[PDB]
Design a protein around this nucleic acid. Sequence first.
RNA 1: ACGGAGGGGUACCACCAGACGUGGAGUCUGCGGCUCAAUCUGACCCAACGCGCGCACCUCACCAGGCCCGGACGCGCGGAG
Length: 103
Amino acid sequence: FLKETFKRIHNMDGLVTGHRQVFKYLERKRAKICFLASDCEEKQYADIVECLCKEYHLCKKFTRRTLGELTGQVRCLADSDKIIKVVPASACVIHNFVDVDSF
RNA sequence: ACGGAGGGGUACCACCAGACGUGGAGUCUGCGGCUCAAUCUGACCCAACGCGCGCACCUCACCAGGCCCGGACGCGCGGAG
């Protein structure tokens, strides 16, 4: 599951993408958790995240495209259908947060 | 319609009887010309010329130079590595 609330989040946002955003959201930000891209371009790219997280709230899952799905980071035509390639993301972080059903 | 045709009428944007003026000097203002990078334009008998309701900026159109897109909305492509 996990595919509807993000959308409810996104209308008020809370998810973020790109390396600069996450780190600035990793430090000095209310990082609840984030579903990573799962060691894509580089593990060390994300080992910077895991090391800091375990040194300083999240987990991992293999579903990057979905990360671009719940994220409004794909061109969605008015018909509510897929158009462009679901833009892979990785920064994952969640802020406002406003899951429990999963745990 | 016109008549250096005829007959009736009329009005100080016609005259008689008079008055006050203008055109003469300096100046305010608008108008053609000359000039300039530009001296933004319209209107030319009555029926254009202190008229288009006060130009240091704006007004502002013209002259010499510089920021901005404030390119709505649909199709293809790319885009958060």
